[PDB]
Amino acid sequence: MFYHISLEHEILLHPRYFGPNLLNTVKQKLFTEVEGTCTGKYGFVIAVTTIDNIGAGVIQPGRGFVLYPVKYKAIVFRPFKGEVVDAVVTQVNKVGLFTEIGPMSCFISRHSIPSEMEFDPNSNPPCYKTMDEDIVIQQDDEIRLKIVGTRVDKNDIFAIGSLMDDYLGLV
Amino acid sequence: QANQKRITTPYMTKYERARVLGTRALQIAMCAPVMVELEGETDPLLIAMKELKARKIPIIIRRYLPDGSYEDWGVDELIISD
């Protein structure tokens, strides 16, 4: 789920950047580093909206790299357990659905897909369908899923979906 | 702490001068911009002393008080004796 929150970060400036235009370089450095990154604590970091305050440079002992704390508001995306969310089915397999929730990859195992659905690799797109084909889940379809599991791997979160209770599945 | 009333001395201490000069000399040695003009000086210490005499060192001294508060003085705000 998308949050807007305030964060703290410290940047070590190579000395070449002292002078006029320095703060703009500081902001651009923050943009370069933190955007696109993902943290198990705050979930994925969508983008840095605004920099509230630039803390005063502190000179470290030796190595002279000046150190700037930056307070900044940014957009992050962090799901939670039991959250129902819109997701997109990017690829299908006999094991289950690999879907994408914005930046996040989410998995729905075969047991978490309801019993009515059988895997048909033979379909022109491999898909999931009932014997009647009434409800057919294939690639690019929009679905609603509960996040029943979240797991952090190398700062990158991927989730586990479930379609059990009512009002879930094809949209 | 009220910056309008700073209780510490308006003079730069010998230790403040020493550390400010060393810090600024290291900054110059690491290719920081110089705030004063230069005739032929290439030693960072000489450049830092020239900047201190000119009152053009971009450093703030954060003097801590025993109670825990602090007072921020610009190097240009202090009285340089030596």
């Binding site: 320095l22 502190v58 | 230790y15 550390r19 400010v20 971009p58 450093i59 801590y64």
Partner: peptide
């Protein structure tokens, strides 16, 4: 003690 009884901060408004 001595040179360690205080901190130094960079003056962003004066580097201009």
């Amino acid at each position: 003690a001595g040179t360690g009884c205080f901190d130094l901060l960079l003056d962003a408004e004066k580097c201009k």
